[PDB]
Amino acid sequence: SKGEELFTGVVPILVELDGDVNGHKFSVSGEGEGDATYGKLTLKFICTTGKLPVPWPTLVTTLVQCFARYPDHMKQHDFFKSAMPEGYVQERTIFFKDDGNYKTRAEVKFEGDTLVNRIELKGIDFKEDGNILGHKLEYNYFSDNVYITADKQKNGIKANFKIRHNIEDGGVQLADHYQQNTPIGDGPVLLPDNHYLSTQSALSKDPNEKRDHMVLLEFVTAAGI
Numbered sequence: 001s002k003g004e005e006l007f008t009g010v011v012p013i014l015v016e017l018d019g020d021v022n023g024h025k026f027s028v029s030g031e032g033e034g035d036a037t038y039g040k041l042t043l044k045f046i047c048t049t050g051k052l053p054v055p056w057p058t059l060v061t062t063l064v065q066c067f068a069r070y071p072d073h074m075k076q077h078d079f080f081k082s083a084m085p086e087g088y089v090q091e092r093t094i095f096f097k098d099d100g101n102y103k104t105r106a107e108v109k110f111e112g113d114t115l116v117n118r119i120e121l122k123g124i125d126f127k128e129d130g131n132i133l134g135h136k137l138e139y140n141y142f143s144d145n146v147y148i149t150a151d152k153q154k155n156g157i158k159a160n161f162k163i164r165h166n167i168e169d170g171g172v173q174l175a176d177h178y179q180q181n182t183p184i185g186d187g188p189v190l191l192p193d194n195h196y197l198s199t200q201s202a203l204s205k206d207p208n209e210k211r212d213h214m215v216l217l218e219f220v221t222a223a224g225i
């Protein structure tokens, strides 16, 4: 595709989210860079409206799969880069088991030489003393597989996966993800064979930063072919 050549080096990334969860409104801004040669993302997010009303870990997935390392033998299955520079719409429902759900819609595209992810999140039916609104999740690390399949009728893809969010002194808060991506442009895109993205997210803090924030180091690699 044309789009693949946009990712051969280090690309600056901007993320902007507006959220509304059980009536609590909030915004997040993120900056960093992605190096798709290595599947490597480094990002820092700030809650610009003050204190974040959900746990940071629950927003990682929402807050640029075009930075996946696709092995050379799977380059024909890389929908994400094939949609660039015009981009794709990424939409999700995220099902928090025994709790509410997030519904997200994002546009991922280049603005100049900057890869931008603009997101609207709406969360409904959360328990106000639940693990999410009660801030009962650990802040550390999670890893999983994003199972991707073609959706020929929207000229895009679907995916699904499950995140096991660690509960502080406890088990796991499951977060079932259902995803669709559709190209923004009229251009052609690569419709993939079934495969997955193996993704590892490491969360940390900037010792100098007083705002509510999250530092993210993530690796994303396509596999399963």
Ligand SMILES: [K+]
Binding pocket: 054, 055, 056, 135, 136, 137, 138, 139
């Ligand atoms: K938390």
